[PDB]
Design a protein around this ligand. Structure first.
Ligand SMILES: [Mg+2]
Ligand code: NA
Ligand code: NA
Ligand code: NA
Ligand code: NA
Length: 320
DNA sequence: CGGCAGTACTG
DNA sequence: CAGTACT
DNA sequence: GCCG
């Protein structure tokens, strides 16, 4: 990163807008920050600032203040509420609206939340694991978690395919959580496995708490056995084999990679989701789907790239 | 002016 | 529905 | 916040 002196300051503002609910302004900052990290050389001129996609007049102005004075005065006017709003929205299940409500109600610490706040089932689990969920795990531990799910799944049906996606598949040395995708090549026998799989994972205490228990998605909490283990976030998605490539692409990410690819698809009259790549998608002027279109055959991830006119990228070069 | 990705789940 | 979450 |  040629421009840490700039991005470190912008990241503070980005996070401030995010926790206060100003999601589109925060998005613009996040995109400018990534663009700046991608640039080869230091940004040295306002003219060079606007040069970059994602950098407008306002962002170029802030870059020029930083280079000339080494500071951004805007940082000095960030609301005193922001560190508390960040503290609260780092509880799993609490976002900007819940954080702002707790702040308005006078809560300033997790002790206040613990002792006085009305918590959802999800949020009580988030609070109970507050520290652990802010920690990453070594890639090796993610391997052990993936293998634990796979062995439980294959005990029911040897034919089930299980793959750890997210940052693991993108090759990262550490992982925030584990993202396991499950399917069956026979196109049918992925159905109804959750009850048995999850109960199997419960029985010797690997699965410690459930956050979401849907027909397709599980989100919860696990812990490997033995001393020195922390609780880890675990997500499981079960999909029919017909959707495997698009589900794999979705679940491998990154989030910004997916958003960029989906935006591209929309420009080409197509729609990309974890279910399918569709074409002849009829939308309105608001960019919203009014006609479904046709699902395009995507047996592999490479087929999705090809149909979008893009060269294939291995998971490691999707880490946007 | 207005989209900024597209979807699942909760209560 | 609004909110929060996932990549 | 940026961009078409
Ligand atoms: Mg993940
Ligand atoms: Na620009
Ligand atoms: Na949260
Ligand atoms: Na009180
Ligand atoms: Na996850």
């Amino acid at each position: 990163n040629h421009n840490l002196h700039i991005t470190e300051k912008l990241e503070v503002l980005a996070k401030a807008y995010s926790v206060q609910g100003d999601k589109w302004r925060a998005l613009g900052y996040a995109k400018a920050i990534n663009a700046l990290k991608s640039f080869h050389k230091p940004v040295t001129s306002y003219q060079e600032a606007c040069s970059i996609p994602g950098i407008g007049k306002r962002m170029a102005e802030k870059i020029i203040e930083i280079l000339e004075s080494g500071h951004l005065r805007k940082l000095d006017h960030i609301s005193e509420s922001v560190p508390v709003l960040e503290l609260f929205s780092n509880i799993w299940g609490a976002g900007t609206k819940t954080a702002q409500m707790w702040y308005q109600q006078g809560f300033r610490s997790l002790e206040d939340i613990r002792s006085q706040a009305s918590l959802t089932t999800q949020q009580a689990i988030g609070l109970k694991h507050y520290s652990d969920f802010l920690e990453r795990m070594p890639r090796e531990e993610a391997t052990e978690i993936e293998q634990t799910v796979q062995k439980a799944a294959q005990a029911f049906n040897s034919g089930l395919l299980c793959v750890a996606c997210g940052s693991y598949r993108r090759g990262k040395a550490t992982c925030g959580d584990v993202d396991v995708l499950i399917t069956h090549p026979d196109g049918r026998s992925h159905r109804g496995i959750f009850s048995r799989l999850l109960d199997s994972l419960r029985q010797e205490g690997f699965l410690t708490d459930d956050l979401v228990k849907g027909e397709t998605k599980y989100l919860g909490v696990c812990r490997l056995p033995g001393p020195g283990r922390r609780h880890r976030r675990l997500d499981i998605i079960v999909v029919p084999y017909s959707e495997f490539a698009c589900a794999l692409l979705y679940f491998t990410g990154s989030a910004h990679f997916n958003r960029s690819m989906r935006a591209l698809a929309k420009t080409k009259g197509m729609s990309l989701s974890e279910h399918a790549l569709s074409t002849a998608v009829v939308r309105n002027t608001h960019g919203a789907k009014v006609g479904p279109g046709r699902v395009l055959p995507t047996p592999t991830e490479k087929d999705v790239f090809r149909l979008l006119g893009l060269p294939y990228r291995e998971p490691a070069e999707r880490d946007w």
